UniProtKB/Swiss-Prot annotation, chains B, C, D:
It comes from Bombyx mori cytoplasmic polyhedrosis virus (BmCPV). InterPro entries: Cypo_polyhedrin_Cypovirus1. This is Polyhedrin. The sequence of strain H is shown. Pfam families: Cypo_polyhedrin. Major component of the virus occlusion bodies, which are large proteinaceous structures (polyhedra), that protect the virus from the outside environment for extended periods until they are ingested by insect larvae. Residues 1-19 form the signal peptide. Glycans are attached at N20, N74, N225. Its main location: host cell. It is found in: Host cytoplasm. Keywords: Glycoprotein, Host cytoplasm, Late protein, Signal, Viral occlusion body. It comes from the Viruses. GO terms for cellular component: host cell cytoplasm; viral occlusion body.
Amino acid sequence: ETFKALKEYRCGSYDECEVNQSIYYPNGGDARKFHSNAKPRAIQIIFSPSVNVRTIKM
Amino acid sequence: NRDFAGREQRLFNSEQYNYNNSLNGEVSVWVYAYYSDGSVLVINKNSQYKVGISETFKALKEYRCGSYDECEVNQSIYYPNGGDARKFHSNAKPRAIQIIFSPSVNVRTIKMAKGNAVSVPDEYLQRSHPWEATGIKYRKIKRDGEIVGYSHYFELPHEYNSISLAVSGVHKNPSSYNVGSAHNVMDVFQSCDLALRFCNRYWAELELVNHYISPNAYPYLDINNHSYGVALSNRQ
Amino acid sequence: NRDFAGREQRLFNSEQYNYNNSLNGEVSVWVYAYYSDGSVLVINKNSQYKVGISETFKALKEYRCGSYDECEVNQSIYYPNGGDARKFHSNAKPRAIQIIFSPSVNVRTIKMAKGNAVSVPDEYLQRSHPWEATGIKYRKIKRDGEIVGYSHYFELPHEYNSISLAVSGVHKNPSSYNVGSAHNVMDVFQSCDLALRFCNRYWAELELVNHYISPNAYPYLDINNHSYGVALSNRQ
Amino acid sequence: NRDFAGREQRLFNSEQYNYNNSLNGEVSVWVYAYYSDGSVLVINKNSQYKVGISETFKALKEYRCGSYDECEVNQSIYYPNGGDARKFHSNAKPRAIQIIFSPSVNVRTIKMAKGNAVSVPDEYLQRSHPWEATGIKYRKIKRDGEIVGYSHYFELPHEYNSISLAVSGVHKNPSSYNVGSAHNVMDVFQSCDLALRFCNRYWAELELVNHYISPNAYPYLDINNHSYGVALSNRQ
């Protein structure tokens, strides 16, 4: 997944487009906020027990 | 001793320091509320004799000038499962509070009523003292060796940290003249009407420092523990 | 007399009753405004020493979180035929008011200024006493033989019942220590800053009872004349 | 020969050049689509062993973050007079494409399937070879005598230039170790999952150069035929 694809989207934007521009390059965007709450705070990766753990790559 | 420009600059600054600390001067309080989006709400009150601020749970939540779901969030914060909200944690809730007093406060007079979300200081009204005297927790904001303000900082990092908040302080008065004695009590009543209030939301702490704290020679302590303000006593 | 769990439960409850009634405790007021849609607005204030609430005509009208015509309604209520409204009776006007005080109030201190829609207590300022002492009209809200609160209920069933409203009460004080004497008057001034306020609109009286009154051990008297609250003095 | 800062800087840069070109390093492709409003869409993919990009006709059209007529435009591009569109030429269609590969590609492995708007490489499926080997058309993007990338630029200036597009290249491998031999084929399958993709639309080529190409040390060839990138082999 891309940076943009991991951000929160609530089914049913302009400012968050600019947030992305300002995250790709410092001061690259014209955003109305310091920290976007749509950014993930954490990630958990889970594999099934059928994986071989020594093959996992990230 | 013939550098009169020098002597007068030092006196001009010292007079400012001392006037603020006189019974004729201001006492000021600020409440900063910090939101997860990095914005900061500031409420300020400036008055003679005594000063304070009191806000509801709802009034401390983030509002971006220029709702239905956040109404329901409030219902669900007043009573568990009382609302029909489409979210677990509202990002409009403050994550932290800083209370700052001017150096003209007497720290031993500071009082705070940090209530729950239905504005009860301590679980139930029947067992609530209406305030706590929190002065011992205030840190000195210092610049150049001078106390420029007093700060109390607290996080609300837990889901259950849903608060109403009032704070109050009395202007210092090392004299034995009681400003609330019969001779002047009507002046203190008038001071309640004369107090000026200010509130505004800054997009970032940088903007708060640059455009609110610094231009007005106010004291501040930032998230990095850095002190801001201007030292005036016996200083050029 | 060796059932210490029993003795301690009774003391815990009695201490709550007595603390609230001490000069260290809260005095509280609530104003309920009832609308024709069956919703209820509540305004609460909790403070030491004394407490009150003051609202404009406009502030008491129903507002459903999440206007042009209702602005004009106000113009037409301030002066007959002063507005260009598209309706005879606004359903946002309250149909009734109930004022409730905590049992820590002294009923003889209660004062009410029920003004007209331009906030004049009695027709013209020049002939207005600024309040009426209405304590004699307050009914005791009782549970289990204990006074848990005091209620004054009045309907506004007529088209001409368009009001502004303020109410005030003083915490009981059977001692001869005047809490507003010079020794403590600055504490009463601070109490004005420290008072916590709450306001919210409930969809129905059921929801008000279930989610506002009951969880907080507040007193209430419903439209059916049924009393709610919790008796604590010498009780398990 | 005792300027070790000098020797180490040259080695640091050379190691970067050589690592990228190793079987352990990245191979990267970019597709730039140029619109008549001067904006540029970039799609990038970075992977080990091999890399490519495949997009539909619809996916290459301009989209400005923050439709009905453009849906109909698509219908009228899939089949003549198939749509009910309110315009002759959609300005959302790209006017030109540039494909850039990293210098770690082997140019003789590059393949492109430039289809029609219904995603057929050559008029009808039945007579289509699924790709063309276009490496001979790629120009060397050079800085300071070093190949920093490879570019294929083509205009779509005609009304009938309505395309779907895929491009693919293999990381250079001058060894006789086949990275797709049985010993490592599962690693190449994993590389398909591990490839990272990026896409964004820049308002102007200036902004693309300033904020996308330059900060990331990527290669680029602008509309004026000027080369960008960073030469690293044996260089300080």
